[PDB]
């Protein structure tokens, strides 16, 4: 997104990379990383389902 | 239902089958019936062991189920960090709630997060807010100066770092303690008794130590977690869930807490002359430290505890241990707290 | 020792009237005990900083009252723990120390394992202490039938 | 500690010291101390005086050049960071620098105060003094220093 300011009068985040839509993953191992990379948009992926979302059908753990 | 070693068993067996013939009187190790019959008798003996240790833990369960006193689950490690800014602030910045910590000693790779928005003040300079650390256990118990960097763009962070070590990271709770809390809770049943305040102030998971002291028409309670440092929130929380145990007729306050300081020297003769170096100086001088800070407001210093704390070490490898200053006990007062300050080992 | 570190718990513990009808003991030492025994008596092994699994063997002795109720039978199990601790450390290093122990050195380990459980039976409280010591029972005896088969085979 | 009992004598001694005259670059042949009559001294030439009357000497006429090289200090805090917190962490006989290049210092007393010589610039007549350090606070530029004698040769 370009065009994009996200202000607040006289108000202002303290971490930088705020009010953009930049997001930061950190994390000492790929098991770490892995987690928050998925865990940061699998939830909000909804569907139809009758049922649930992706999350309850795929286990995406004992990463290592 | 009695437990029984494997020999009694099998010799029982041998007798009941050797009535009626004649025939099978050789048990040598190598005859193969002396074989089968040890197998059955070492199957009964571990069934009747498995047996009591599940009766142990169908009791247990029972306790739990009855009075719904669930045992403590892992409890979160958490305490407090210093930000500071290359210049003073501004402007009111805005901190939300879920910003991340991390360490960058590769040691202590663990994670940490807020849970309660923090905002500066303007003019300021530094301010210190909590961090609660995602992992439960062992882990949370970094030491000191563990946390460096924010891990996130930090512009207006030069550095991070923490002036007190984290001790509330903890273990799950062993069968004693859960025991040790449910007598408590038994005994708690008649309010208006100090027994029974003991219980309705502990009845929050986080806090550990917690003492009453009572005067003439007032009622005052002291209580810290591990780290020694009470909180307004675990104040209000303490206060919003005692009310189904406070004195009806009496005023009651949760509040009083101090750091009372103490310097410990000890001499120890080491049964081995060689092997005196610096390096097991530091390493009992660590163990000293660790068990005088979990003491508690309640508990008090006493010289034979000590010696017990530190001759956990073998005696064949320390033969002799003596204090040239401590000679007699030190009566904590009820506000304050007996805790390491500092310690100074020599061997002679 | 050469390769990884070991508990301090284990460290500490490890460098320190009845008798059954069926087991004899014996307080003969293997040779392999000998030799491995002084290099844990000695400062020149590795050794973490921290402990964990409490649920082993050596903290269920350490907690239980058998060092001043019974110093003879703790004797024993530390007899028995020296012996088990150095054949597991051949085999996964360190393959020179083979040809030092044999099968007798292991069979009086069961006569010593069989003796003392019986002593700890007759209390209730070593219940979690014997219901270790009778799964390596089985264990040692398996290692006597193929010691001798895999000394030739190494 | 030196550095603290001779920042406390001067404390003590401070009202008696009025002889003394502050000027920008007073390097006079004559000791203080040592003699009533009235002399012109500015802060590195009085801390290195103070300094002689002990065993140790230093050096003459001890500029800025004599802590970068001489190895005499070890820097307590670095310049280009001004915390108003940190300031009761500090401790008595503390060197105190002003000015964006180094153009005076100071002594660290307690209670939140330094010595020092302030005046007009054309030789003032104004004689030694103490001030608080909410008004210097400005232009205290982060930089503190500290003395050790145990080491060095």
């Given at each position: ?64 | ?183 408590s ?9 100090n027994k029974?305040?003991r219980?309705?102030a502990l009845?929050?998971?986080?806090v550990e130590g917690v003492y009453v002291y ?7 309670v002291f209580a810290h ?70 003491l508690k407001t309640s508990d008090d210093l ?30 904590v007062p009820p506000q304050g707290i007996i ?10 | ?154 | ?153």
């Open positions: 997104i370009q065009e994009v300011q996200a202000v607040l009068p006289e108000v202002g985040w303290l971490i930088d990379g705020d009010g953009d839509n930049e997001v930061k993953f950190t994390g000492s191992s790929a098991h770490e990383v892995m987690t928050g990379i998925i865990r940061r948009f699998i939830p909000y992926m909804k569907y139809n389902y009758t049922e649930n979302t992706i999350d309850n059908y795929l286990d995406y753990d004992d990463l290592s | 239902m009695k437990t029984r070693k494997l020999t009694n068993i099998l010799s029982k067996l041998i007798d009941k089958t050797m009535a009626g013939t004649s025939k099978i009187t050789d048990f040598t190790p190598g005859s193969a019936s002396r074989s089968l019959l040890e197998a059955v008798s070492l199957e009964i003996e571990q069934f009747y062991i498995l047996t009591k240790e599940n009766i142990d833990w169908g009791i247990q369960e029972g306790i739990i189920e009855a009075f719904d006193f669930q045992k403590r689950q892992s409890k979160r490690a958490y305490g407090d960090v210093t930000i500071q800014f290359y210049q003073p602030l501004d402007m009111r910045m805005y901190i939300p709630a879920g910003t991340t910590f991390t360490s960058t000693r590769q040691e202590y790779p663990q994670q940490f997060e807020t849970l309660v928005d923090y905002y500066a003040e303007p003019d300021s300079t530094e301010i210190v807010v909590e961090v609660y650390c995602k992992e439960t256990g062992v882990a949370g118990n970094v030491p000191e100066g563990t946390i460096n960097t924010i891990a996130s763009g930090s512009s207006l962070i030069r550095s991070v770092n923490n002036e007190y070590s984290f001790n509330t990271g903890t273990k799950e709770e062993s069968q004693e303690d859960f025991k040790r809390r449910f007598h809770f038994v005994e708690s049943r008649g309010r208006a008794t029974s305040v219980y309705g009845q929050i998971p986080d009572e005067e003439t028409g007032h009622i005052t977690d591990r780290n020694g440092n009470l909180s307004d929130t675990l104040k209000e929380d303490i206060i919003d869930a005692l009310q189904d145990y406070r004195p009806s007729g009496i005023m009651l306050d949760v509040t009083g807490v101090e750091k009372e300081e103490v310097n410990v020297s000890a001499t120890v003769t080491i049964s081995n002359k060689s092997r005196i170096g610096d390096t097991l100086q530091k390493h009992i001088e660590s163990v000293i430290r660790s068990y005088l800070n979990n006493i010289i034979t505890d000590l010696i017990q704390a530190i001759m956990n070490i073998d005696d064949v490898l320390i033969y002799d241990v003596s204090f040239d200053n401590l000679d007699e006990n030190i009566i805790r390491a300050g500092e310690i100074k080992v020599e061997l002679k | 020792n050469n390769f990884i570190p070991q508990p301090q718990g284990l460290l500490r513990f490890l460098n320190t009237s009845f008798v059954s009808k069926f087991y004899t003991p014996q307080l003969q030492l293997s040779e392999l005990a000998k030799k491995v025994l002084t290099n844990i008596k000695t400062d020149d092994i590795p050794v973490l900083e921290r402990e964990f699994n409490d649920n082993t063997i050596i903290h269920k002795a350490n907690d239980t009252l058998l060092k001043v109720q019974a110093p003879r039978m703790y004797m024993i199990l530390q007899s028995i723990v020296l012996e088990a601790y150095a054949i597991v450390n051949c085999f996964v290093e360190n393959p020179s120390s083979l040809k030092y122990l044999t099968e007798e050195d292991v069979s009086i380990t069961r006569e010593n394992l069989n003796y003392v459980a019986d002593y700890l039976g007759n209390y209730d409280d070593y219940n979690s202490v014997v219901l270790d010591l009778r799964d390596l029972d089985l264990c040692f005896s398996a290692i006597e039938l193929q010691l001798p088969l895999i000394k030739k085979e190494a | 500690p030196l550095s603290t009992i001779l920042a406390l004598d001067l404390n003590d001694n401070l009202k008696s010291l009025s002889n003394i005259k502050y000027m920008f670059k007073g390097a006079p042949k004559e000791n203080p101390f040592g003699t009533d009559k009235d002399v012109y001294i500015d802060t590195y030439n009085l801390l290195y005086w103070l300094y002689l009357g002990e065993d140790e000497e230093l050096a003459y006429p001890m500029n800025i050049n004599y802590f970068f090289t001489e190895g005499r200090f070890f820097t307590i805090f670095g310049k280009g960071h001004k915390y108003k917190v940190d300031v009761s962490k500090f401790i008595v006989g503390d060197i105190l620098f002003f000015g964006r290049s180094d153009t005076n210092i100071g002594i660290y007393v307690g209670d939140g105060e330094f010595i020092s010589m302030m005046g007009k610039f054309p030789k003032d007549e104004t004689p030694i003094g103490k001030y608080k350090l909410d008004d210097y606070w400005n232009e205290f530029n982060g930089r503190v220093m500290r003395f050790d004698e145990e080491v060095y040769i």
